[PDB]
Every structure is written in C-alpha cells, then in structure tokens.
Amino acid sequence: ATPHINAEMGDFADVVLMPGDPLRAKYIAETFLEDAREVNNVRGMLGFTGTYKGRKISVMGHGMGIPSCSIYTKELITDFGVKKIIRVGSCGAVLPHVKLRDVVIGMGACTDSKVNRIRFKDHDFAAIADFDMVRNAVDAAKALGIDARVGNLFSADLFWSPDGEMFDVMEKYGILGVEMEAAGIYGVAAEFGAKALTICTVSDHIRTHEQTTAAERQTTFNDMIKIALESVLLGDK
Amino acid sequence: ATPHINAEMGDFADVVLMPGDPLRAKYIAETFLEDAREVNNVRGMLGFTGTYKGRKISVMGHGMGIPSCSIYTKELITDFGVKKIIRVGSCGAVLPHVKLRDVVIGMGACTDSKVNRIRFKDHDFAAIADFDMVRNAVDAAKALGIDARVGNLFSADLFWSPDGEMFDVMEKYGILGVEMEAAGIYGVAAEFGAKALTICTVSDHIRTHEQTTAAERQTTFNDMIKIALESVLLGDK
Amino acid sequence: ATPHINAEMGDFADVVLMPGDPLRAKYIAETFLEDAREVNNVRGMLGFTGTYKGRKISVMGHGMGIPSCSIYTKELITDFGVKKIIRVGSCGAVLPHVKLRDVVIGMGACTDSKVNRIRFKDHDFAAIADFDMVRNAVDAAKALGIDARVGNLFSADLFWSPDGEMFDVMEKYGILGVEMEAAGIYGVAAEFGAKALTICTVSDHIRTHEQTTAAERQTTFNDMIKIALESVLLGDK
Amino acid sequence: ATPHINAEMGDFADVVLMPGDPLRAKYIAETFLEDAREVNNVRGMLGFTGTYKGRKISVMGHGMGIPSCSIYTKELITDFGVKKIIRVGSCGAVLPHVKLRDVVIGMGACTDSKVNRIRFKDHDFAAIADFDMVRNAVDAAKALGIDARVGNLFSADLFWSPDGEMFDVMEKYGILGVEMEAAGIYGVAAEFGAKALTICTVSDHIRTHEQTTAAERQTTFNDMIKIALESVLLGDK
Amino acid sequence: ATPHINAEMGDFADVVLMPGDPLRAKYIAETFLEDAREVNNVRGMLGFTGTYKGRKISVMGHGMGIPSCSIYTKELITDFGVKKIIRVGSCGAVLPHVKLRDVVIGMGACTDSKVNRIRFKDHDFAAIADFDMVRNAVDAAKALGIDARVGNLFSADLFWSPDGEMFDVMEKYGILGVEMEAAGIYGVAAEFGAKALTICTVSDHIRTHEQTTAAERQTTFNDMIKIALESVLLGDK
Amino acid sequence: ATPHINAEMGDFADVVLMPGDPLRAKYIAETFLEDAREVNNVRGMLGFTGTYKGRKISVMGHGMGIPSCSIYTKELITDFGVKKIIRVGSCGAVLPHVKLRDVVIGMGACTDSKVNRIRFKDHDFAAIADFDMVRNAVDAAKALGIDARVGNLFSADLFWSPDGEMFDVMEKYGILGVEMEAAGIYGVAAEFGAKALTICTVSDHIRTHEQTTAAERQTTFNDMIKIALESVLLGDK
Ligand SMILES: Nc1ncnc2c([C@@H]3O[C@H](CO)[C@@H](O)[C@H]3O)n[nH]c12
Ligand SMILES: Nc1ncnc2c([C@@H]3O[C@H](CO)[C@@H](O)[C@H]3O)n[nH]c12
C-alpha cells in the first residue's frame, strides 16, 4: 500500500484510466469491464480492475486539480507498476469551432500551476503526452467513426477564475479545452519515467452557452471511454 | 445547486467543518452531530448537516489540494450562505520539537501554489485566517486541556515534492505543518468575502517516519473536532 | 556595537517599540518612559531605554522602508538580546469603512518587496506577527476602550506608487492599512528567531485626502503607544 | 514585401522548410527541388521556391535563436500565406540512449526564453508542433527505414549556458535534443494560427564527446530533408 | 511642503547631494558650503542649502534603502524643482582589485529590489545614471588627481543578506561596489524625468577584511564630496 | 576554431565591429579597412581583418537577436582574444524628439529577454556598456560634427511584439532606441570580462511613420562606422 492507495502490487493493470469523479470510475468499470473488482477505496477514491476484450485494465478516480491527480498518478507509477495513465474527463471550450460533445486529445497541456516550474528550474517545461498513446487514440477514434481534435489543453488551478481575461488568451493561442489535470499528469509522467494521455469531451462552452440532450452527451462520454480502451489494444500490438 | 454541490440554499449551516477525506466527514456527522442528514454526494464528496449541542453545523469533505478545496469553499460561500469554514485536517511536521498528534492552528499559510499571485498582481498576499476564529480555537483547546500551537502552515501543491531542500527552508522559517489546502482556502475567503480557519493534527513527521496506532489517530482526530466545534460555540457569543 | 547601533548588550530592554520617525521615539521616551536615557544616535536614529510602570522598555526609530527597518531589527535581535519588536507606525487606508485615526493590528503583512521571496525560495511566505503579541494588543486596546481592527497590512516599497490600480486589489483583498515595514520586520523576526508585531494608526486615506488636526494626531498616537506598552505588561504575565 | 523578406504574396509555397544555416537553403533547393527560383536575398537569407514530386515547396534559412526564427516565421505566415513551417536542424543530446545522427522530432519544445510567457500572461504555454505534421514525419521516416524519436526538445537562448546543471534536469525529464528555435517557432505558429514542426539530427552529445565523418553528416542531413519533404506529401494525403 | 519635506519651492538648489546619513548632510554643509541654512528637519532627515564657489547647492540625507531614498528623491524632483541628484555614499567591494578608499562611480546599478520590475512591466530596466553627470564626475576626479572606477553598483535590499552566494555572482559580473540606493534613485530619475548619479567610496571588502587609518578614510570621503561638487560646476558650463 | 568561427587565435583584432546584417561586414571591410583579409565564413557569417589608420580592426556580422549575437561575442572573447566589441546597427525610436537617422549610443540596455536573469540569480542586472567606449564614441561623433544621444536602448526578443503597450512604457522611461542585441552583448561582456558598446542609427519611428532615401541611409550608416572606428583610436589614447 501507499499513503493514498490501499492495494498491493498486481492489483492494478499496467494501464489505468482515470476520470476525476470516483463515481465515474465505478460507472466505467461496471459498463465496460468484465469481472471487475474494487481495488481501492481510501478517501472514497474508488479504483477497479477488470478486463476489456480479455485485456487487464484498471480505472480509478483522480480527484479535481493538479495536486490531487499528481498524488494518485505518482503512487500508481512508483508502487503499482503502472506504465500508462489515460485521463478521461470533461473540459470547457473557448474556440468557436470547437463544439459541445467534441472529443479533444491533449498532445500538450498549458497551465497556470507552478508545479512544472518547480520541477524545471523555473523554465518552461512543455507538458506533453506520449506520442504513441496519442496516435493510438486518434486511430481508435477513426475506427469508431469519431474524429478527435488533437492539440493543447489548459490545466487550470482555479475552476472559478478571477481572471476572465485569460480565456481570451487561451482562445488566441488555440487551446482546445480547459480542464484541471493534464499538465500535472504529464509532469508526473516525465518525472517518474512513465507515459500519459488526456482525452476529454467538451461539456461546456465559455463562448456560446448551450447544451444538448443528456442521451447525446452520455453517448459521447461512452465514445471517449471506448476510444481510450481501444487505444490500449492498439498500443499492445 | 452548483456545479459540484447538489443542494439548495438552507441545506448547509452557516459554518462548515471540512476534512480532506469525505469518509471523515461521514464519521464526524455520525459521531458528533445529532439528526445528521446527507446534503451532498456529487463526486462522492460527502456533506452533512446536523446539530451540535443545538447548534446547526455542517461537515463536508474538500478533497486534496488547493484546486479541489477552492472549488468547494467557493460554492459554499457564493450559493449556500456559508460564513465560516473550518478546515480540520492532517499535516506533516518539519520542526523537531513538533510531535505526532500535536494540534496546529494556522494563523497564516505559506504556499508554493500560484493561486494567490494570480489574485494579487504577482505580489505577496499573506494568506491569513480570521483572527476571532483563531482565538476561539485557542480558547476552546485550552478549555479541553489540549495543547495547540499557533503559527504558519505550508500549503504544498506536490505531496511528493521533487525539492526536498525546501523542507529545510520551511523548518528555518518556523513552519508548523505541511498540508495542501489552507493558503487556498484563505485566498477564497478573502476573494469571496467569508471567514476561514485551518486546524490540523500532525499525522506524520517529514523527517522521522514516526508510526502511530489506529486508536491514537482516532483520539487525536476527535480532539481536533471537539476544538473546532466548541470554537464555533465561543464565536456565537 | 553593531554597524548601525552604537550601544552594548544590556543597553536595550528585551522589548523595543519602534516608530519610523526617530523624533517620535524621542517623544515616546519623554512622554511615557521614566528615567529614559539615550542609547543610540548613529545616523540620527534615536533610541532610548527607560521604564514604564517599572518595566524596562526601549524605543528606537527604524526609518522608512523594509531595507531600513530590516537593518535595525536584525541588529537588535542578534546583538542586543531583543526578544520582541513592536512597530508603532502610521498607515494609509484603502477600505471606505476604515476611518482616519483607526487603530489597525497587522496579524499578517502583504508586500510587493522581494525580500521574503529571497528568503523563501521564491515561494509565498505568509509574513505574520506573533499570535500572543497580537492577542495582548487586542486585550490592551479593549481595556483602554479603544477599537482596533485585526487583519492584513500591505508593506509597500514605493510610497509614490506608479501602480494606482494595485490599491483596488488591496481593497478587494481586505487590506486594512498600507505602510512600508511590517512584512520586512516579520521576515526578520522569522529569520533571526524573535517575535514581532506591527500596530498602526490610519494617518491618511489613499482615496480621500481627509485632513486631520495636530491635536487629534497626538491623542491617537498616544492611544497607540498606550496599547503597545500595556500589551507588553499583559505578555509578561 | 516585409521588413526582412523582399518578396510578394505567391512567391513562397504554403510549406517552407527552414534550416538554421542560411547556406543550406541553396543546397536544399539544388539537391531536392525542381525548377527552383530565387525569391529572397535580404540580409543574405536566401530563399527559394520549387517543386518536390510536383508539390510546391520553399526553403529559406531562419538564423540562430528564437528571436531570429520568430521574425521569419511570423512574416511568412502573415504576409506570404504560409501554412506549414518545418525547421530542419541539428541538436545536442543529453540522454545516454540518444546517439549521434539520430533523428529527433519535437512534438513539444521546452525553453528558457521568456517569449511564450510574454504571450501567455506569464503562465506555462506548452509549445507544441502540429500533431498531423509529427505523424507525417514519423511515417515518412519509417518508409525510408529510419526510426525517429518523438518527444520534447529544449530551445535554449544561450548556446554557451552558464548553468551546466540544467542539462541534468533536461536529462531527468526526458529531453531528446537541445537546439535554439523550436519553442519560438511553435509560439509563432500558435500566435498567428499556422502549423509547425521541428526535426533535428543529433550532432553532439553534450556531456560526452565523439565525432562523425563529413560523409556521414551529409548522408544524415539528406535523410532529414527527405523525411521532411516526404512528410509534406503524406500531409497532402 | 511635501509629506516628508517641510520646505517650499526655492529652498533647495536645482542640484542636491545626498548621503544616507542625515548627520553627514550636516557634515557636508558645514565643511564645504558657505552661508548654509537648514531647510528640512522632518523625521530628522536634515537638509541644507548653501553655496560652493558661488554656486547654489543643497545637501540632504536620504536614509537607508531603496524605499527611503525613493521618497526623498521623488519629492525633490516633483515639488522642489530639483534637476540633478548626486548620491554620495559608502559601498562594500567584492572584486579583489577594488581597494579600500577607491572612488566608484555607478554608471549603472543592479538590484534585487522589485521596484523597477513594477515600473517596467516585469522586464529588465537598466537602471543608469545620466551620462553627462558621469563624465563631469570623471573629469572632476581627474582634475583632483583621483582616478575613479566607472561601472556597475549593486543596490541591495538586505544589508544582512541570507544569500551569501550572491556576492560570488556580483564578483563574476564585475560589480564594483555594493550599496542600497543607486538603482532606486535611477528608477525615480527615469520615472520623473530628472538626472542622477551615485558616487561611493569603498568602506569595506567582503573579500579581504582590512581597514586603513581614519585620517585616510576621511580624506577619501572628502575627495568624493569635492568630486561631486566640482562635477556640478563642470556641468554648468 | 570554435563551433561558429573557423579561425585561429590572432586571426581577429582585439576590437571587432559587428553589424546585424552579415552583408555589411564585407562592405565595411572594403569601404573602411586597408589590406583586409577573410578570416571566417561558416554559416555565411563572413569575417574580415584589416587596419584603419594603422590600427588592426576586425568586422563580422552577429545575426539578429540576443541568442545569435551572444554566440559570436562569447566565442570571440574566449577563444580569439577579443577585448572590445562594437555593435553597429539600427533601431526604432519611441520618443517624439528622437528623429530618423539620429545616432544613439546605448550606455545601458533594457530587455525582455531572460538571459541576464539566468546569469544573475533572477535579480536585475544592469546591462551596461564600457564607460570609456561610450565617451570615445561621443567624442568621435562630436569631432565629426555629429551629436549623438546617450542613454538606454531596449533589446527586444520579439520584433513583432504582441504587447504594443510596452512601447508606451519604454517612452515614459526614456528609452532612446529599440533593437534586439545590446543587452545580450553587454551580458556576455560582463560574463567573460570584456568590454562592449552598441551604437545605432534610428531607422524608424515605431509609433509614427515616414521614410528616407537610399543615399541618406548610406550616408548615415557610413557616419556610424566612422564614429565607431574613430572611437577606437581615441580609446587607444
Ligand atoms: N507531509 C504531508 N505533506 C503534505 N500534505 C499532507 C497532508 C494532508 O493530507 C492530504 C494528503 O495526504 C492533503 O489533503 C494534506 O492536506 N497530511 N500530511 C501531509
Ligand atoms: N499611504 C501610506 N502609504 C505608504 N506608507 C505610509 C505610511 C508610513 O509612514 C512612512 C511614510 O510616510 C512609512 O514608514 C510608512 O510605514 N504612512 N502612510 C502611508
């Protein structure tokens, strides 16, 4: 066990999907995994391990924000043999042409956190995903008839920002989605020598206030999970 | 309701105690509150409302890290009429004379987060608790015969810090405990116009491991909760 | 002697009250101290030692600005056995409800100086007063029937600031008074191992001019000095 | 014309290859392009436009360093309709497993320049390539029997850095090559809404030392240019 | 009058010499000026006006540190018609070849203060003297047979620095003397459209602990004052 | 030889003039030097060595931007015995009184580059010229009937700056010319113990607009080179 995960080596697969919401980890395990067992419940951060098309896969919540997800991803990598993290989450859009229910793949993640400056001698660390994992996710989405956008996320420390002006800056520089984790996960992956990827579905538009039907939103969420799971199978080959 | 709290105005008391762990909020509601009802379970972040000695009191987890607790404390302040937040958490000691299970009251909170620089035009915002709440907690602790040290916490973004030498700097400057929230809660309280206090118990020593037993953790946790609850009653006078 | 104080160990009491203006130190010695003797005049920075109600007390100017007061407070701590420093100064208000001649107690001090970043590895050091000294000043003020607000000061490097908009940010974050020393004194106290408190009277309003008379300044100055001196007597118990 | 390019709209292809050494532009034009014409000569920064397998391609040097290449890439994008920039350069390696003459593709670029902080309100902009361009280069290299590594470059402002220890940090965080341009090119591409990619060959191992032959270096340079040119054809699908 | 100078327009000459120590301003006026009158005594910061070889000249202390001298120099420029400030002070040496009693002229001043970053949008403002004033001082020193060194000063915020390492950095980059004011005076001069110069005598060596005779030190101090006064006469022609 | 200069010790004079445009080096050699010989050609950065009135002088371009000119000036100082660098370039003006074709001498250079913060532990290094070189240029200009302005340049990293408002700040603080090199050259000179000077002619007024003739621009360039060369002879006293 580690300070935030009451489990032993082998309880997790070498790939872990991670939503922010632990109740979504339970949702994913029940919906997509066969023979799924709960393997962590410390602090309510439910984690599960099962199989997808015979392949051992884990899913566990990471909580909200860079500090929370940095704890869980570190401990998985250093003590549970985890080689790949796929964050599966929601994000807010700032670009007009990025629509509700688009699937966004974060090849990079900008941030207003200081954690990577702390790692990188106060210089600019480009927080990036693993290229092969990005390619696997693009290819899995194509096989499913979903065309994902690949680009930069912005990982914010303040969901309730005082700086409304920063959203115009994100739009100017082409940020595809705003979430709260990717840059921290990518920093952990680089620090501890593992691989990570963040996929998000667009849940909100800071530009055009608008909302679709729940059935359509939930379909797209499941499409993101299918993309993540099928991308693992591609990487295995 | 708000994006992370499925409740309505009136469901929360005007004072909310907040551990990081939602399961500890459940324990506090079951152990210390009469007629406790669950008022939130979104993302598993359990929150409850009941009475302590006739006084309406709420307790809700805030998750780990400044970004997580900033979400919950903001929404409580802006949409649920919450006037006082008392974080009741754990922390790690860097000072040799600060012992396991000591109670620490954070009159100020240092941090390596950027959130207060974003608020404060990149200058030094001294993230401080409400003085009256600090005095109430000191007095409540004295009435219970519990020692309590008052001073600075350090709110870290990285539990697994790559900069071990910074602990020497914390120690040099008298930091009483390392946790991950106080400076963010104090920044939210100032931004959104409420009052806050962080109380912690020393759960680990960052230099010396110092293992504790389960029965000792519960006694000291209960002591911290008693201090917080009794401090509310003092402030009501 | 030290580079800026021509005195020897024992010439100062273990508590030193410090206005910015050396002429105010002379006035304090003449008005409040019995058997006062001058113990320093290097650079005209007048310092005196006498007794208040039998208690040995010193009073010495510290000059204007963090660099100036950091010199004097350091040398007092390291070479003259000084244990407590009480700055007794003036400040400018930014909050509409903070009135001229109000007494403000700086439990914390914000700043735009770099001195604490230099100390604290470029992170946020919360520059705080000693809690017991804060409580002593609150209690002494209550015993004298004088109102006193407790909260954050802002210690500015530029009295003539080129950034007028920053006063809106100070006001937003509840800053009670703008002065030029507290955050530096609190940083010295932490660095060199002593205790400090800043008390100020609102001498000007940064928005509204608000002129005062000479007799009102003296009464309120005397009130601040009485609070400081009586707070020492409370701390001795 | 623009301040640094004496040409008119249409004189450049929508894709420009850019070496750092201006002498390589004429070499690339004569060796790889058909029907090349001269389109710029100001400051000796010769530019040429021709075709590769029928596809219009331009080539022009960018000069050493982020400020130099930022000038040329901006003017090409805003006044010459350029949609894709491929930098073709050399880099130094810090990783033991990265060998001399290896081909490195910069999906991201770290930097110690301030240019992207100036752009991005002093936050962390992840300077990234266009994903399709990255994959095109990977696939073109594979078709040529060259395995390319994809990851982070580091774009240095100081070739002669006074901070040797930063190379250890680069190694820890997996930096594949050190050059002086990619992060600046990627920032320009994001600022003005275009696409860019940096491909480098390893010319030195910064912390070890060993050499190659002139014929080996020419073969490897030619390989890089073939990868770049064939990658464009793949992008045209 | 201004908040820190109780005088009226005309009471000061259009050139003011400024030592840090107000008792030194009295020393300079009595030693070098004819018909000298005291024109300020607020906060004990003595200022005087007299004639040197028939030329109207003022001398007034500026206190220790950038915040103190920034107050006095601003108020002189904006409200007393002062066109030129000459700081005349002491400094500590870090270079081996810079000796006790050398005269140093600060054509530039480095600093660890934040005041110029506040003025200059967090970029690097090169805090420089007025060229003509530098040339006048060099020429006056030559006429007196003193060969002054012209170069960079370092203006420190902390006389008692915690960062001993910075002195090696100053030596590496050729800093001639360490004092506490020049960069702030030069920032004020630029902000308010006036001219300034700092001259110092070397009073201490952070390298070679050593001291000369008082008679020789005082001779060199008077040489610095003569250089400053004669340089004004050169500028007048 | 060095990585960017294929020459040996003695091939360069101890004084090197450096334009930004590499084509100007050959022009300066043919127009002003006697007996010139070619001493470098790598990357097309032609260097020449000859004599001016019997005095050995070299000329070689430095490329655009701080990183480019930092490479060449470092290698000249550390491997070719170069003692003085004179940059001879153009700049844009922000002050209304600074006219097209004015000669500006940069006694200091502000910057938005990070290179000197990297050198100087993130403090403010005042990037300054050598004083004697400044005065030599002023005196040589006066002997040629040219009045030169001496003050601060601003060395920009982005010719195409996204922050137009910074030009207002430059104007307020008296910046004479905007170019892209001086602060970097001055930092190298300080780092490696040599001397440097930047002279520029005003080629544009950034916030207004108007033009000159080709013959006027050639006359003004020739004037600048004559000033530079005659200033060297004055320095040799
Ligand atoms: N040495 C330590 N360091 C950082 N945080 C903590 C904590 C607290 O517990 C959580 C991490 O375990 C987090 O919410 C933090 O506030 N306990 N001990 C800690
Ligand atoms: N509006 C104001 N702003 C900044 N400082 C002060 C002060 C205090 O008085 C001095 C400046 O007049 C200085 O020591 C500072 O602490 N009073 N009013 C102030």
Author numbering:
A (entry chain C), B (entry chain B), C (entry chain B), D (entry chain A), E (entry chain C), F (entry chain A): 1 to 237
Question: What text does the study give?
Answer:
PNPs catalyse the following reaction: β-purine nucleoside + orthophosphate ↔ purine base + α-D-pentose-1-phosphate.
First, a single-tryptophan Y160W mutant was engineered, with the mutation in a close proximity to the active site, but without significant interactions with ligands. The structure of the ternary complex of the Y160W mutant with sulfate and formycin A described in this study has a nucleoside bound only in two active sites per hexamer, located in the neighbouring subunits, but not belonging to the same dimer. Complex crystallised in P 6122 space group with the half of the hexamer in the asymmetric unit. The position of formycin A in the active site of the Y160W mutant, in the structure presented in this study is virtually the same as in the active site of the WT protein. Sulfate ion is bound in the hydrogen bond distance from Arg87, Arg43* (from the neighbouring subunit), Ser90, Gly20. Ribose of formycin A is involved in hydrogen bonds with sulfate ion, Glu181 and His4* (from the neighbouring subunit), whereas aglycon—with Asp204 and Ser90.
